[PDB]
């Protein structure tokens, strides 16, 4: 915005989609998906 | 060029123009000549009687 160094204005942007607003399994009628999770070593140890 | 709206291709074009003009500065400095003396290519001094 100016003629010298560091003289700027910042515009922030946001990632907007289903994921960042929730609503993933809106499921009004009760049929949908969850895409549950990915396992880890802690999960394996807990499972035994 | 310093604005963040420009993309990579735009920055490349602007830097191409910048490089061309820097080359012009160097060329003018090298080729400017008076009576066989490169005035802008030396850091010396001239004496006039």
Outline of chain A = elongated
Proportion of beta-strand residues of chain A: under 5%
How helix-rich are the residues of chain A, as a percent range? 10-25%
Number of helices of chain A: 2
Count of β-strands of chain A: 0
Category by helix and strand content of chain A:
mainly alpha
Q: Tell me the quaternary state.
A: part of a larger assembly
- The Cα radius of gyration of chain A reads 22 Å
One letter per element, helices H and strands E, the order of chain A comes to: HH
Cα-to-Cα separation, first versus last residue of chain A: 60 Å
Q: Main sheet of chain A, how many strands, which sense, barrel?
A: none
What is the element layout, followed by pairings?
This is part of a larger assembly, with two copies of chain A.
Chain A: H1 18-21, H2 41-47
Features:
48 residues; part of a larger assembly; flagellar polymorphism; Flagellin (chain A); elongated; mainly alpha; motility; Bacteria flagellar filament; 0% strand; structural protein; 2 chains
